[PDB]
Design an enzyme around this catalytic site. Structure first.
Site, mmCIF file in Angstrom:
data_model
loop_
_atom_site.group_PDB
_atom_site.id
_atom_site.type_symbol
_atom_site.label_atom_id
_atom_site.label_comp_id
_atom_site.label_asym_id
_atom_site.label_seq_id
_atom_site.Cartn_x
_atom_site.Cartn_y
_atom_site.Cartn_z
ATOM 1 N N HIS A 36 32.514 21.747 70.588
ATOM 2 C CA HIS A 36 33.282 22.198 71.204
ATOM 3 C C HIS A 36 32.848 23.037 72.182
ATOM 4 C CE1 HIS A 36 36.515 25.625 71.768
ATOM 5 N NE2 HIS A 36 37.201 24.518 71.922
ATOM 6 N N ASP A 63 31.911 17.959 64.923
ATOM 7 C CA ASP A 63 31.915 19.240 65.858
ATOM 8 C C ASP A 63 30.461 19.603 65.992
ATOM 9 O OD1 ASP A 63 32.226 21.408 67.533
ATOM 10 O OD2 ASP A 63 33.122 22.967 66.028
ATOM 11 N N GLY A 141 32.945 33.392 69.891
ATOM 12 C CA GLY A 141 31.732 33.447 70.726
ATOM 13 C C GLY A 141 30.494 33.038 69.902
ATOM 14 N N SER A 143 30.508 30.330 67.913
ATOM 15 C CA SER A 143 30.393 29.038 67.722
ATOM 16 C C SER A 143 29.019 28.267 68.124
ATOM 17 C CB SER A 143 31.494 28.246 68.455
ATOM 18 O OG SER A 143 32.805 28.580 68.348
ATOM 19 N N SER A 159 31.533 26.158 63.498
ATOM 20 C CA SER A 159 32.410 25.422 64.189
ATOM 21 C C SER A 159 33.765 26.431 64.257
ATOM 22 C CB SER A 159 33.003 24.325 63.158
ATOM 23 O OG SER A 159 33.943 23.559 64.073
#
Lengths: 198, 6
Positions: A36, A63, A141, A143, A159
């Site tokens: 992502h 992801d 943030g 991720s 994720s």
């Protein structure tokens, strides 16, 4: 830049994500992160300097992604824990019930336990299947950041989950948190990567 | 659920 799990990076001077793990692909240096976070060829910067670009990604569905870095970057077998570090030793997958911690630029280093595997997240973009759920908190943030046991077994990359209106799930009890991570094993095999360990 | 990112 010194590449350590958990630190901030920006994508095309806009979005922020966290580094998951230092890896190599043959002589190429890279880091694994969340899909992502960027599209193929997006530019990643650390502390304002260009460090590499997205070499591949899958999202939604899965992801994951890896960023190939310039040879000037320094890969380290470590994940940030405050001012300290956790050494990466391998990628043995922990079972449901094991304790695990995650590191990211928004909530720092948070620990909890693994509560379920093979969970589907229905994000607005489409479902992401096969994620592992933990109850360590996280926020916008985080991720792409590292999920690892205190013994150094890297588990996967952040994720998403049930962020509340303050931007994280740290203000709700561990019992109500759904913090999902993409397993690292399939990303290392899909892209032929080797984890940097110490 | 939302991905995340920031």
């Amino acid at each position: 830049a010194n590449i350590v799990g958990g630190i901030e990076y920006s994508i095309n001077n806009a979005s922020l994500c966290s580094v998951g793990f230092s890896v190599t692909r043959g002589a190429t240096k890279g880091f694994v992160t969340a899909g992502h976070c960027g599209t193929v060829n997006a530019t990643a910067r650390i502390g304002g300097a260009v460090v590499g670009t997205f070499a591949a990604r899958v999202f939604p569905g899965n992801d994951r992604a890896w960023v190939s870095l310039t040879s000037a970057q320094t890969l380290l077998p470590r994940v940030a824990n405050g001012s300290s570090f956790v050494t990466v030793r391998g990628s043995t997958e922990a079972a449901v019930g094991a304790a695990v911690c995650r590191s990211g630029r928004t909530t720092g280093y948070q620990c909890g336990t693994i509560t379920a595997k093979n969970v589907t997240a229905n994000y607005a973009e489409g479902a992401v299947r096969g994620l592992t759920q933990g109850n360590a908190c996280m926020g916008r943030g985080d991720s792409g950041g590292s999920w690892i046991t205190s013994a150094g077994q890297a588990q996967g990359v952040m994720s998403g989950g049930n962020v509340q209106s303050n931007g994280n799930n740290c203000g709700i009890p561990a019992s109500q948190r759904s913090s999902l991570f993409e397993r690292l094993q399939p990303i290392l095999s899909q892209y032929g990567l080797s984890l940097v360990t110490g | 659920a939302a991905p995340x990112x920031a």
